[PDB]
Amino acid sequence: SYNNIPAGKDAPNDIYVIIEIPANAAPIRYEIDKDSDALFVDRFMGTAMFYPANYGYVPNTLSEDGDPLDVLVVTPYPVAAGSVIRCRPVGKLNMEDDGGIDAKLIAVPHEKLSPLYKDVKEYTDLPQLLINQVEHFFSHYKDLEPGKWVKISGWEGADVAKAEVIKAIEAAK
Amino acid sequence: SYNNIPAGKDAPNDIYVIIEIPANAAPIRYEIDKDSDALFVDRFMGTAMFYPANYGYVPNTLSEDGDPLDVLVVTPYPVAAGSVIRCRPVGKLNMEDDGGIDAKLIAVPHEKLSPLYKDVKEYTDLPQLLINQVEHFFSHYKDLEPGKWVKISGWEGADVAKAEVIKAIEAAK
Amino acid sequence: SYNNIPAGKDAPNDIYVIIEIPANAAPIRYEIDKDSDALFVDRFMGTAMFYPANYGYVPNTLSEDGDPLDVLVVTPYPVAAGSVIRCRPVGKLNMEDDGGIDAKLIAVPHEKLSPLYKDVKEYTDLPQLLINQVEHFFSHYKDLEPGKWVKISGWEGADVAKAEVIKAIEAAK
Amino acid sequence: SYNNIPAGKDAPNDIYVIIEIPANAAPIRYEIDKDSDALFVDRFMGTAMFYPANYGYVPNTLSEDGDPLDVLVVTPYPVAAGSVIRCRPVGKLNMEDDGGIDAKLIAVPHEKLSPLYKDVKEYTDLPQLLINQVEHFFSHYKDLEPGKWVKISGWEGADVAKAEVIKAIEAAK
Amino acid sequence: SYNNIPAGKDAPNDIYVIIEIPANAAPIRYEIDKDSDALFVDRFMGTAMFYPANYGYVPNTLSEDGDPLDVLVVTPYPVAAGSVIRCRPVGKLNMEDDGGIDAKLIAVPHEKLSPLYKDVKEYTDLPQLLINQVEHFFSHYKDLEPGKWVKISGWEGADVAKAEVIKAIEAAK
Amino acid sequence: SYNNIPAGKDAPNDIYVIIEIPANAAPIRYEIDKDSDALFVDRFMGTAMFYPANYGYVPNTLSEDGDPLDVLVVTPYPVAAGSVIRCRPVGKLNMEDDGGIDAKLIAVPHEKLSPLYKDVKEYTDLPQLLINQVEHFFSHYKDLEPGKWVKISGWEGADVAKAEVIKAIEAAK
């Protein structure tokens, strides 16, 4: 049970993220059931696109999606599906979808995992093309799913990124 | 425990299949133990062949193999090992092996996973080469395993494919 | 030399396409120099997208924009970069570029290369999602390259594709 | 829980090994937590190196690392992460590290998994370059991790390789 | 040009092989044009099989069937398509085709390319399963291509392989 | 022909590099013949290491050791072997070989190829770990090839890299 994994070692700036879809992976949406812990294939993406970064969730949280809080982690090389990355939140990606709103945070590995992003304090420190690529992926990856839309709102800093994790931690209590 | 996963949402025409070997994967037979849920490597295949499609089993079933009922699912791109696909059975592949008989069903993803096979009602709707390739794989993939043989019998439709799942559901009760 | 290859053994029904970019490949736009026949790295794609079919051109052809005839070849597996596929046109995709009007043909392999695409004689015989991914790919793969933009106009039948081949072979060396 | 898996079927010469890092894999150290069973990313390796073989551990053991006994298995093709290989120990690789000593055994699949190494009785039967490559990997793969060193001591045979498993079996009792 | 390459620095012990199909590659039969030196897509394989060694030919040789000498080069890792391996023959595989009689040599890389195959001087020094996969691959990889069929006759020693090289170099340009 | 390509559109700021070995590729050292322009397999690497950047040379240049100018091109994704990257030098790596003194330039792609490396104007603008992996790779990738050894001397600025380009173009065809 992935519930055994804490939301981190020192939340907010130390979250664990269980990866469901690796970066640059096959065009397949995976989602982890929270009763069997198995990797469920949600949909074979219609668009000819791939995820710009690893995307998963923080364990033992709850937002207004009904499901835990979604995270996108940037790594030097994609991680295996079902893996847990000790990362640090550095931004929040707000956007409106068919069923209300959705909010993704962008994350980055920790001191002991990788020195690559010691200078990444907030999402603006990542390369501009990546941020532009992350926005472009979510706006268009569901363009062939009938009835489903996505519109990108704006970005928010790490301090508010590290805020929504604070509120999702006890919303699961 | 994969036993938490039901055999489906609306059996017969809505089975779940836990994939043990992805399509076009490395020449390695994986099998999921049903006590630890871990992915066990059964044998490194002697033949220079790969699985024509993802092959796994429906959870919480039982046939006359002693183990659950085996399924081959056709997907636009191979799924990760240990994943569960919400698919629909569309055929049955009968064949005789060293220890009696074995029966595989061919399956196909569902409305909400992929529109690719909305027109696939039975195995004859899949391309002929695939069916010919699935038969050729099982007939020859054990040609270098000493003492083991496989002979291909015939094909059966979805209605009888959806029959053996009916009988394997309660044979596990 | 590359232009030591005819446009087709029996054009326009039988044509050759040198492949410049493979399908499902890394997002690297390759274009083949004709002074040198070396593979030139033209663009590292900004958008998180991949080519839905192997992209290339017909040897010994000259289109309007000054270069040979663009062809997307649909194959069972992605072919190597710089390899020659013997194929047959089945449709034509029309668009307007930043430089004016553009057009990409779509083709399936020759009968002797694969039996998978024989009853595919028009582009509408191809899967409906594949046609939509080609439309979606070309409409958005330049979204993050500045100065470029693509507007999808509409498809034309297999007979017009063979006509544009005839006209491209016409004005060339 | 991987604890359900025995240390083998007939220890010593029949150990099970849960693979955490596949061979020739991405430069990523994985480690399996022994409370959640999840695949944890330990560190993104600084060196431009890959693991010469699959490396994991024997379940339900304990050495003087505090963690179970580490094993390197040689296979015809890399196994998926989180898989369990029925292998046979054929050597011991002693070496001193920043925190005391570490000891790895080299292993090899069994009769029923692969005939490739029926003649491999001890690590000297494997190709010399592999042994030289295994030594070179561990000596240098942490050259960019600050504060961490590794020095290679020597090799020991299967009989002593099959000894340390004997002592790690009951050290977990 | 490709035929600007000798059959070997010191034939028949030292030979060159241009590789047409890599090992463990996608099931695409490539053959290299000699008018053009471009890589031609000859066949999308029907059978779910892959080449057990990199397939190619010796430059500046002419066999009976009208084409250069077929050689399978066993390498630690699959080499790129269209690349030149400096290798040494160790055996000969004999068969009868639909067009008559055929023969494929098997070779291991030159000493300066790898120390892994030095004490391999006959094909029986290669692993016994590898010899059987080459026999099984050629006997079945054309099972689904109509009009073709291959019958394995038997192997011949390393000395006959060097003799066929001498005779192939003999009648050529 | 390959030497039908200039050293650069506007050397030394704009240069071309034919890539001989891609990044993160299989440990196969390729070198491009100039008699033939075919890709020659030079060495199957003994050490379990991979190239940290795509390795190649500048056309129409002549260095001291008799061959064109070595350049490592850092790219978002590894480019195909034998492809031409339009790039800009940002630093120089100096070393002493078994044959004397050696030097490898490091380069980032031209502005028109990617916006990711524009504010990279010196090699110290590249990530500090990447600089260390190139130093570590060249210092150890020949550890298991006998007769060879590499000693890292130190880096030099982007202005010296443009100077060595000028001198390499100078004494050449």
mmCIF file with all atom_site columns, N, CA, C and O in Angstrom, chain D residues 130-143:
data_model
loop_
_atom_site.group_PDB
_atom_site.id
_atom_site.type_symbol
_atom_site.label_atom_id
_atom_site.label_alt_id
_atom_site.label_comp_id
_atom_site.label_asym_id
_atom_site.label_entity_id
_atom_site.label_seq_id
_atom_site.pdbx_PDB_ins_code
_atom_site.Cartn_x
_atom_site.Cartn_y
_atom_site.Cartn_z
_atom_site.occupancy
_atom_site.B_iso_or_equiv
_atom_site.pdbx_formal_charge
_atom_site.auth_seq_id
_atom_site.auth_comp_id
_atom_site.auth_asym_id
_atom_site.auth_atom_id
_atom_site.pdbx_PDB_model_num
ATOM 1  N N  . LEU D 1 130 ? 33.794 -8.901 -18.287 1.00 0.00 ? 130 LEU D N  1
ATOM 2  C CA . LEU D 1 130 ? 32.672 -8.623 -17.396 1.00 0.00 ? 130 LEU D CA 1
ATOM 3  C C  . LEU D 1 130 ? 33.150 -8.417 -15.964 1.00 0.00 ? 130 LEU D C  1
ATOM 4  O O  . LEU D 1 130 ? 32.797 -7.424 -15.316 1.00 0.00 ? 130 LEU D O  1
ATOM 5  N N  . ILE D 1 131 ? 33.965 -9.346 -15.459 1.00 0.00 ? 131 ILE D N  1
ATOM 6  C CA . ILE D 1 131 ? 34.511 -9.214 -14.109 1.00 0.00 ? 131 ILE D CA 1
ATOM 7  C C  . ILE D 1 131 ? 35.309 -7.922 -13.986 1.00 0.00 ? 131 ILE D C  1
ATOM 8  O O  . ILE D 1 131 ? 35.159 -7.167 -13.018 1.00 0.00 ? 131 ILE D O  1
ATOM 9  N N  . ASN D 1 132 ? 36.170 -7.649 -14.970 1.00 0.00 ? 132 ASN D N  1
ATOM 10 C CA . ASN D 1 132 ? 36.910 -6.392 -14.981 1.00 0.00 ? 132 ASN D CA 1
ATOM 11 C C  . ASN D 1 132 ? 35.973 -5.196 -15.072 1.00 0.00 ? 132 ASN D C  1
ATOM 12 O O  . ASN D 1 132 ? 36.260 -4.137 -14.503 1.00 0.00 ? 132 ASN D O  1
ATOM 13 N N  . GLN D 1 133 ? 34.853 -5.346 -15.779 1.00 0.00 ? 133 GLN D N  1
ATOM 14 C CA . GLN D 1 133 ? 33.887 -4.260 -15.908 1.00 0.00 ? 133 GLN D CA 1
ATOM 15 C C  . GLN D 1 133 ? 33.087 -4.068 -14.626 1.00 0.00 ? 133 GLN D C  1
ATOM 16 O O  . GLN D 1 133 ? 32.765 -2.933 -14.258 1.00 0.00 ? 133 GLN D O  1
ATOM 17 N N  . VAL D 1 134 ? 32.755 -5.162 -13.936 1.00 0.00 ? 134 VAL D N  1
ATOM 18 C CA . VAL D 1 134 ? 32.046 -5.049 -12.663 1.00 0.00 ? 134 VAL D CA 1
ATOM 19 C C  . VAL D 1 134 ? 32.920 -4.347 -11.632 1.00 0.00 ? 134 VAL D C  1
ATOM 20 O O  . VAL D 1 134 ? 32.453 -3.473 -10.893 1.00 0.00 ? 134 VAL D O  1
ATOM 21 N N  . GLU D 1 135 ? 34.204 -4.709 -11.575 1.00 0.00 ? 135 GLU D N  1
ATOM 22 C CA . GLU D 1 135 ? 35.124 -4.036 -10.663 1.00 0.00 ? 135 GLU D CA 1
ATOM 23 C C  . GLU D 1 135 ? 35.261 -2.559 -11.008 1.00 0.00 ? 135 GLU D C  1
ATOM 24 O O  . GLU D 1 135 ? 35.246 -1.703 -10.115 1.00 0.00 ? 135 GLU D O  1
ATOM 25 N N  . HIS D 1 136 ? 35.401 -2.242 -12.297 1.00 0.00 ? 136 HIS D N  1
ATOM 26 C CA . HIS D 1 136 ? 35.588 -0.853 -12.702 1.00 0.00 ? 136 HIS D CA 1
ATOM 27 C C  . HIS D 1 136 ? 34.364 -0.002 -12.397 1.00 0.00 ? 136 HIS D C  1
ATOM 28 O O  . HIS D 1 136 ? 34.502 1.187  -12.089 1.00 0.00 ? 136 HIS D O  1
ATOM 29 N N  . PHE D 1 137 ? 33.164 -0.581 -12.480 1.00 0.00 ? 137 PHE D N  1
ATOM 30 C CA . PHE D 1 137 ? 31.962 0.197  -12.206 1.00 0.00 ? 137 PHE D CA 1
ATOM 31 C C  . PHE D 1 137 ? 31.921 0.647  -10.753 1.00 0.00 ? 137 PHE D C  1
ATOM 32 O O  . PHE D 1 137 ? 31.717 1.831  -10.465 1.00 0.00 ? 137 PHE D O  1
ATOM 33 N N  . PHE D 1 138 ? 32.114 -0.285 -9.819  1.00 0.00 ? 138 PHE D N  1
ATOM 34 C CA . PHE D 1 138 ? 31.966 0.057  -8.410  1.00 0.00 ? 138 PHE D CA 1
ATOM 35 C C  . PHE D 1 138 ? 33.091 0.961  -7.925  1.00 0.00 ? 138 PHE D C  1
ATOM 36 O O  . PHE D 1 138 ? 32.878 1.773  -7.020  1.00 0.00 ? 138 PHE D O  1
ATOM 37 N N  . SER D 1 139 ? 34.280 0.858  -8.524  1.00 0.00 ? 139 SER D N  1
ATOM 38 C CA . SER D 1 139 ? 35.393 1.696  -8.090  1.00 0.00 ? 139 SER D CA 1
ATOM 39 C C  . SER D 1 139 ? 35.183 3.158  -8.461  1.00 0.00 ? 139 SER D C  1
ATOM 40 O O  . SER D 1 139 ? 35.672 4.049  -7.758  1.00 0.00 ? 139 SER D O  1
ATOM 41 N N  . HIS D 1 140 ? 34.459 3.427  -9.550  1.00 0.00 ? 140 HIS D N  1
ATOM 42 C CA . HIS D 1 140 ? 34.399 4.764  -10.120 1.00 0.00 ? 140 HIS D CA 1
ATOM 43 C C  . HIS D 1 140 ? 33.008 5.381  -10.171 1.00 0.00 ? 140 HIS D C  1
ATOM 44 O O  . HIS D 1 140 ? 32.907 6.588  -10.421 1.00 0.00 ? 140 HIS D O  1
ATOM 45 N N  . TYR D 1 141 ? 31.939 4.613  -9.948  1.00 0.00 ? 141 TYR D N  1
ATOM 46 C CA . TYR D 1 141 ? 30.598 5.154  -10.153 1.00 0.00 ? 141 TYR D CA 1
ATOM 47 C C  . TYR D 1 141 ? 30.222 6.217  -9.129  1.00 0.00 ? 141 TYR D C  1
ATOM 48 O O  . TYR D 1 141 ? 29.286 6.986  -9.372  1.00 0.00 ? 141 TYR D O  1
ATOM 49 N N  . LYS D 1 142 ? 30.927 6.289  -8.000  1.00 0.00 ? 142 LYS D N  1
ATOM 50 C CA . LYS D 1 142 ? 30.667 7.304  -6.987  1.00 0.00 ? 142 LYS D CA 1
ATOM 51 C C  . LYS D 1 142 ? 31.756 8.371  -6.946  1.00 0.00 ? 142 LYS D C  1
ATOM 52 O O  . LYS D 1 142 ? 31.887 9.079  -5.943  1.00 0.00 ? 142 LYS D O  1
ATOM 53 N N  . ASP D 1 143 ? 32.539 8.504  -8.020  1.00 0.00 ? 143 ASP D N  1
ATOM 54 C CA . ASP D 1 143 ? 33.615 9.490  -8.058  1.00 0.00 ? 143 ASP D CA 1
ATOM 55 C C  . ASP D 1 143 ? 33.107 10.926 -8.049  1.00 0.00 ? 143 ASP D C  1
ATOM 56 O O  . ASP D 1 143 ? 33.898 11.839 -7.790  1.00 0.00 ? 143 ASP D O  1
#
